[PDB]
A paper describes a structure:
To that end, we performed detailed structure‐function analysis of a completely uncharacterized set of proteins: the putative metaeffector LegL1, a leucine‐rich repeat (LRR) protein (de Felipe et al, 2005), and its cognate effector, RavJ. After using Y2H and gel filtration analysis to demonstrate a physical interaction between LegL1 and the N‐terminal domain of RavJ, we cocrystallized and determined the crystal structure of this novel effector–effector complex. The co‐crystal complex of LegL1 (blue) bound to RavJ (1–226, red) was solved to a resolution of 2.0 Å. The heterocomplex has a 1:1 stoichiometry, with LegL1 forming a canonical LRR horseshoe‐shaped structure arching over and interacting with the RavJ active site identified above. LegL1 forms a canonical leucine‐rich repeat structure arching over the predicted active site of RavJ. The interface spans 1,240 Å2 and is reinforced by LegL1 K194 projecting into the RavJ active site where it forms a hydrogen bond with the predicted catalytic residue C101 (inset). LegL1 acts as a direct antagonist by blocking the active site of RavJ.
Residue numbers in the entry:
A (entry chain a): 1 to 228
B (entry chain A): 0 to 246
The structure:
């Protein structure tokens, strides 16, 4: 049962990434989108920032960059699992989930890797994008159709070797207020940060992950239900 | 042109704010004449958002000095160094966003020489310490330079610019060397230096700063000791340290 890109997008929409506390709004205020969702995310950050519970675990560490890219599928799925679990911290009665531009892509990677149909149609990749003088400032999750390989560091991923049918998943962009059509399971041409996509470095490839086959699916529950 | 339509223009026309927003429409250079015609027909529109399109330097040439637009967002296009050079010739623009356009040091060289500019957003533009040198001589009151490898030499130059009141420079390869010189600055009222390599070594200088009321130092290397020092400065009403290895 082939899953459509829209069905993949709707799955990611269920995670309500726009409801996250985006912790590096304090670092990159100008990355807030000119949308209702961007306006709301800015307000949610302000309240979070001035709330003492933000300086308690695991929220405090959730805001901290995780520089080491996870090399096992299970870690990604665990990342999504732990981010979604209920907590006592609420902002105006709202569960608090926290991420940033380096770790946000890990959540989506987990969600995507946890679907049995995704794993047969797509390889999952996590890349460092937004290249600046040897550093890659923005992590992104890729859905690569099966059987297309990606360059391994120090080789860079470029437009020329970007596999046809690759879908981009950037929940950080959604946290910042971009609509799903610009960030969740879409071709690069529709991607909000297409202008900083290449060059990129590929830090994780599910196709090179030998623990993948032993890694199970269907561990996660969609954070919300679909409206009718 | 071949993409922009009258329907796009009227849906993008916010008559309450006198603002025209045309982001994500894949507009090209050839669409600029129609755009300017519409703006000339509605002179009250002085704020324009052209972000996330496919405009090049040629499109800028078709736009500049056509309208009374004073606030322009043309981020996430492809205008390059020459596009920035041309914008620097515009006689109405005072607030400009050219982020994500690969304008480079040469692009910023022109913009920094434009005394009309009050506010410049130029995130991710391959701006280096050389470009920061140019901006250090500008009359800009606010600059946002996130995702540009300015390095210490870069922000040290910027720190000498007496005109800048607000500086945003997160993920700019700034260490304690650069941060300390920015701390010594007596004009900045807002400074954001997230995602850099700043440590507790800078914090005494920020504690003794007398100008800042906003200071964001998230996702650096600051510890609880640095936090304690920073919190002695009560002039800073907005202090952000999220993401530092505190406690």
């Amino acid at each position: 049962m082939a899953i459509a890109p829209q069905q993949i997008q709707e799955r990611l929409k269920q995670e309500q990434y726009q409801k996250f506390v985006v912790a590096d709004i304090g670092n990159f205020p100008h990355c807030l989108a000119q949308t209702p969702e961007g306006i709301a995310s800015g307000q949610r950050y302000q309240k979070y920032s001035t709330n003492s519970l933000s300086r308690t675990p695991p929220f405090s560490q959730w805001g901290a960059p995780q520089l080491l890219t996870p090399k096992s599928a299970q870690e990604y799925i665990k990342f999504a699992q732990q981010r979604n679990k209920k907590s006592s911290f609420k902002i105006d009665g709202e569960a608090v989930r926290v991420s940033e531009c380096s770790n946000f892509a890990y959540h989506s990677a987990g969600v995507l890797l946890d679907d049995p149909q995704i794993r047969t149609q797509y390889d999952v990749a996590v890349i460092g994008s937004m290249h600046s003088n040897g550093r890659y400032l923005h992590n992104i999750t890729l859905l690569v159709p099966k059987g297309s390989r990606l360059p391994q560091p120090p080789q860079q991923l470029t437009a020329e070797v970007f596999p046809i049918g690759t879908l981009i998943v950037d929940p950080w962009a959604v946290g910042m207020g971009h609509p799903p059509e610009q960030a969740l399971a879409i071709p690069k041409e529709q991607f909000a940060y297409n202008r900083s996509l290449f060059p990129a470095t590929v830090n994780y490839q599910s196709a090179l992950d030998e623990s993948l086959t032993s890694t199970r699916t269907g561990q996660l529950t969609p954070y919300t239900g679909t409206p009718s | 042109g071949m993409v922009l339509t009258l329907s796009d223009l009227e849906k993008g026309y916010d008559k309450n704010l006198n603002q025209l927003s045309l982001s994500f429409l894949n507009l090209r250079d050839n669409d600029i004449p129609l755009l300017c015609e519409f703006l000339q027909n509605h002179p009250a529109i002085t704020s324009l958002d052209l972000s996330h399109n496919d405009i090049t330097a040629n499109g800028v040439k078709l736009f500049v000095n056509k309208t009374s637009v004073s606030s322009l967002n043309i981020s996430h296009n492809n205008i390059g160094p020459e596009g920035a050079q041309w914008l620097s010739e515009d006689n109405h623009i005072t607030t400009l966003d050219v982020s994500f356009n690969e304008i480079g040091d040469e692009g910023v060289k022109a913009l920094a020489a434009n005394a009309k500019l009050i506010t410049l957003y130029a995130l991710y533009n391959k701006i280096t310490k050389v470009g920061a040198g140019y901006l250090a001589q500008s009359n800009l009151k606010k600059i946002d330079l996130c995702f540009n490898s300015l390095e210490d030499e870069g922000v040290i130059a910027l720190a000498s610019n007496i005109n800048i009141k607000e500086l945003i420079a997160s993920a700019c390869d700034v260490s304690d060397i650069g941060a300390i010189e920015l701390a010594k600055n007596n004009q900045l009222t807002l400074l954001i230096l997230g995602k850099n390599a700043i440590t507790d070594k800078s914090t005494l200088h920020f504690a003794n700063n007398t100008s800042l009321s906003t200071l964001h130092l998230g996702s650096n290397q600051i510890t609880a000791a640095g936090k304690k020092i920073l919190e002695t400065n009560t002039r800073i009403t907005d202090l952000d340290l999220i993401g530092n290895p505190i406690e």
